Amino acid sequence: NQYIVARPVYSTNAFEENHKKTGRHHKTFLDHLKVCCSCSPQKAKRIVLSLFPIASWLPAYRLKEWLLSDIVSGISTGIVAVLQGLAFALLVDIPPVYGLYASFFPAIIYLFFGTSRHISVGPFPILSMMVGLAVSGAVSKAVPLLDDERVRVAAAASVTVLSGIIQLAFGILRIGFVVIYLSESLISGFTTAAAVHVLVSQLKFIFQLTVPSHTDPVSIFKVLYSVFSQIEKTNIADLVTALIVLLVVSIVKEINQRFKDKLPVPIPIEFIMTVIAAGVSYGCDFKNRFKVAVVGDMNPGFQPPITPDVETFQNTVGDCFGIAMVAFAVAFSVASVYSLKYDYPLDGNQELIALGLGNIVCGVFRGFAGSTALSRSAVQESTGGKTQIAGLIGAIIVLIVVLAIGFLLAPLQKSVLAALALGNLKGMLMQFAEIGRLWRKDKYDCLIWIMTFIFTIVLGLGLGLAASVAFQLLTIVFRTQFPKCSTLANIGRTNIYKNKKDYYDMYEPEGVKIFRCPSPIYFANIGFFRRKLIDAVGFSPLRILRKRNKALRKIRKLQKQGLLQVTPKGFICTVDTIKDSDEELDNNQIEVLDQPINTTDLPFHIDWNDDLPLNIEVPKISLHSLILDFSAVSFLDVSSVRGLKSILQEFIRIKVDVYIVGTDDDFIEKLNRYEFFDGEVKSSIFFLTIHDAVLHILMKKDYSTS
Amino acid sequence: NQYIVARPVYSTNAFEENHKKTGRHHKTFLDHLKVCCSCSPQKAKRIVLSLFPIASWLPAYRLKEWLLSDIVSGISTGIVAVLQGLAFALLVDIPPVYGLYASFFPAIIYLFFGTSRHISVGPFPILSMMVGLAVSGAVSKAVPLLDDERVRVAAAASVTVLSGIIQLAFGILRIGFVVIYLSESLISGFTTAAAVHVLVSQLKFIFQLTVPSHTDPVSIFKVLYSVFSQIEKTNIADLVTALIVLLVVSIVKEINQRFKDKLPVPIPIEFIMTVIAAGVSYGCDFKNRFKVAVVGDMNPGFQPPITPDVETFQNTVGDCFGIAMVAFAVAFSVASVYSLKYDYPLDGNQELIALGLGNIVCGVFRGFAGSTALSRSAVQESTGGKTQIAGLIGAIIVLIVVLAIGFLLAPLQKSVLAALALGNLKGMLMQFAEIGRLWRKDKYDCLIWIMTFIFTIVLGLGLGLAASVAFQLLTIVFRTQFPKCSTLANIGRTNIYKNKKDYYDMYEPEGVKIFRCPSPIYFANIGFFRRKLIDAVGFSPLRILRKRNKALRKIRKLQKQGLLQVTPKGFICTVDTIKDSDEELDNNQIEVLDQPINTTDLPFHIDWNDDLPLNIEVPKISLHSLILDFSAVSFLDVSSVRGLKSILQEFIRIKVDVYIVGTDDDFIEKLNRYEFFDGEVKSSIFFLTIHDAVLHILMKKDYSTS
Ligand SMILES: [Cl-]
Ligand SMILES: [Cl-]
- Please name the residue of chain B whose CA is at the shortest distance from the CA of residue A341: B591
Tell me whether strands B512-516 and B625-629 are parallel, antiparallel or unpaired.
parallel
Out of A584, A634, A637, whose CB is closest to B634?
Answer: A634
3-state secondary structure A185-250: HHHHHHHHHHHHHHHHHCHHHHCCCCCCCCCCCCHHHHHHHHHHCCHHHCCHHHHHHHHHHHHHHH
What is the spatial distance between Cα B378 and Cα B80, in angstroms, rounded to a whole number? 11
| Pick among A333, A452, A588, A661 to test the B interface (most B CBs inside 10 A) | A588
CA of B125 from ligand 2 middle (Å) equals: 6
DSSP string of A86-146, one letter each residue: HHHHHHHTS-THHHHHHHHHHHHHHHHH---SSPPPS--HHHHHHHHHHHHHHHHS----H
B478 touches chain A (CB under 8 A): no
Query: Is the minimum CB–CB distance between B501 and chain A shorter than 8 Å?
Result: yes
The values of phi and psi at residue B265, to 5°, are -135, 145
The verdict on a CB contact (< 8 Å) between B523 and A639 is no
β-sheet bridge partners, residue A573: A564
Tell me the nearest-neighbour CA distance from A506 into chain B, angstroms: 10
Q: Please, are residues A58 and A386 in contact by the beta-carbon 8 Å criterion?
A: no
Distance from CA of A588 to the nearest CA of B (A): 7
Residues of B whose CB is below 8 A from A21: 502-504
Query: Checking DSSP bridges between strand B625-629 and strand B657-661, what pairing results, if any?
Result: parallel
C-alpha–C-alpha distance, residues B242 and A685, integer Å: 55
Instruction: List all residues 6 or more positions away from A483 whose beta carbon is below 8 Å from its beta carbon.
Output: A517, A518, A519, A521, A525, A528, A529
Nearest to B570 by CA among B620, B619, B616: B616
C-alpha–C-alpha distance, residues A298 and B55, integer Å? 81
In Å, what is the CA distance from A243 to each residue of A79, A240, A249, A420?
22, 5, 10, 10
Amino acid (1-letter code) at residue B91: L
Measured in degrees and rounded to the nearest 5, phi and psi for residue B580 equal -80, 125
> A180, A490, A550, A676: which to substitute to probe chain B, counting the most B Cβ within 10 Å?
A180
Write out B178-240 in H/E/C secondary structure. HHHHCCHHHHHHHHHHHHHHHHHHCHHHHCCCCCCCCCCCCHHHHHHHHHHCCCCCCCHHHHH
Which of B10, B383, B638 lies nearest to residue A441, judging by beta carbons? B638
A341 with B590: Cβ contact below 8 A: yes
Residue B433 near chain A (CB below 8 Å): no
Closest residue of chain B to A383, computed from CA coordinates: B587
Q: How far apart are CA A457 and CA A199, in angstroms?
A: 12
Rg of chain A, C-alpha, whole Å: 36
Query: What are the chain B neighbours of A691 within 8 Å (beta carbons)?
Result: 3, 5
Strand duo A486-491 + A512-516: pairing: antiparallel
* Closest by CA position to A657, among listed A684, A691, A629: A684
Q: Is A339 on the interface with B (CB under 8 A)?
A: no
A507 in reach of chain B (CB within 8 A): no
Cα Dmax for chain B: 124
Is A289 strand, coil or helix?
helix
Looking at CA atoms only, how far is residue A18 from chain B in angstroms?
A: 10
Comparing CB atoms, the residue among A22, A65, A477 nearest residue B503 is A22
φ and ψ at residue A302, rounded to 5 degrees: -95, 170
d(CA B374, CA B329): 12
Distances (CA, A) of A82 to A178, A376, B676: 31, 11, 43
- Nearest Cα neighbor of A471 from B614, B470, B210, B504 is B470
B263 touches chain A (CB under 8 A): no
- The C-alpha of B502 sits at a distance from chain A's nearest C-alpha, in angstroms, of 5
Would you say B103 and B92 are in contact if contact means Cβ atoms under 8 Å apart?
Answer: no
Cα atoms found within 13 Å of the Cα of residue B650, Cβ hemisphere only: 21
Q: For residues B568 and B525, is the Cβ–Cβ distance under 8 A?
A: no
C-beta separation of B220 from B456 below 8 A: no
Residue B297, Cβ neighbours under 10 Å: how many?
12
Q: Which residue, among A68, A265, A664, would best test binding to B if mutated, counting the most B CBs under 10 Å from its CB?
A: A664
Contacts of A560 (CB under 8 A, 6+ apart): none
The CATH number of the structural domain formed by B486-539+621-705 is 3.30.750.24
Helix, strand, coil percentages (3-state) for chain B, rounded to 5, are 60, 5, 35
* CA–CA distances in Å: residue A286 to residues A237, A271, A388, A430: 8, 20, 40, 34
Inspect the interface and report whether the beta carbons of B2 and A4 lie closer than 8 Å.
no
Q: What share of chain A is helix, strand, coil (3-state, %, to 5)?
A: 60, 5, 35
Q: Where are the domains of chain B?
A: 63-181+231-300+345-450, 486-539+621-705
Q: Is B342 on the interface with A (CB under 8 A)?
A: yes
| Contact (Cβ atoms closer than 8 angstroms) between residue A53 and residue A109 | no
Query: 631-660 in A: which are within 8 Å (CB) of B?
Result: 631-635, 637-639, 641-642
User: What does the DSSP 8-state code read for residue A672?
Assistant: T
Q: Which of residues 16-35 of A touch B (CB under 8 A)?
A: 19-22, 24
- Residues with a beta carbon under 5 angstroms from ion ligand 1: A 373-375
Are A7 and B9 within 8 A, CB to CB? Answer: no
Q: How far is CA A579 from the centre of its chain?
A: 66
Residues 78-137 of A with CB under 8 A from B: none
B228-247: string of b/e by CB count within 10 Å (b at 16+)? eeeeeeebebbeebbebbbe
Instruction: Using an 8 Å CB-CB cutoff, list chain B residues near A699.
Output: 1
d(CA A600, CA A591): 21
Contact in structure between B212 and B133 (CB atoms under 8 Å): no
| CA atoms of A578 and A614, how far apart (whole Å) | 6
Closest by Cβ to B504, choosing from A20, A516, A591: A20
Give distance in angstroms: CA of A191 to centre of ligand 1.
10
Nearest to B632 among A185, A527, A634 (CB): A634
CA distance B3 to A686: 16
CA distance B610 to chain A (A): 25
- Using alpha carbons, select from B514, B497, B485 the residue that is nearest to residue A15: B497
Q: Does A581 touch chain B (CB under 8 A)?
A: no
Please, which residues bridge with residue A570 across strands? A567
- Compute φ and ψ for B545, nearest 5 degrees: -65, -40
- Nearest CA to B487 out of B518, B447, B454 is that of B518
What are the C-alpha distances in Å from B287 to residues A499, B231, B238, B278? 76, 21, 11, 11
Residue B296 phi, psi (nearest 5): 90, -175
Question: Nearest Cβ partner of A691 from B3, B22, B699?
Answer: B3
A256 vs B: CB within 8 A: no
**How far apart are the C-alpha atoms of A616 and A558, rounded to whole Å?**
11
Packed helices B125-141 and B414-429: angle between N→C axes, nearest 10 degrees: 120
Nearest-angstrom CA–CA distance, B574 and B579 = 14
CA distance A656 to A653: 7
Q: Are B620 and B609 in contact (CB under 8 A)?
A: yes
Judged by CB atoms closer than 8 Å, whether chains meet at A2 and B9 is answered as: yes
- Is the backbone peptide bond immediately before B266 cis, with ω within 30 degrees of 0? no
A102 vs A79: CA distance, rounded Å? 14
Question: In chain A, which residues have their Cβ closer than 8 Å to the Cβ of B385?
Answer: 587
Smallest Cα distance from A540 to chain B, Å: 10
**Contact yes or no for A502 and B341 at CB 8 A:** no
How far does the centroid of ligand 1 lie from the alpha carbon of residue A242, in Å?
Answer: 19
CB contact under 8 A, A673 and B8: no
Q: Are B170 and B194 in contact (CB under 8 A)?
A: no
Report CA A223 to chain centroid distance, whole Å.
31
Contacts of B179 in chain A (CB under 8 A): none
Q: What is the dihedral of CA A423, A425, A427, A429, to 10 degrees?
A: -130
Gap from CA of A369 to ligand 2 centroid (Å): 51
> How far apart are the CA of A330 and the centre of ligand 1, in A?
10
Rounded distance, CA B474 to CA B68, Å? 51
CA-nearest residue to A466 within chain B is B470
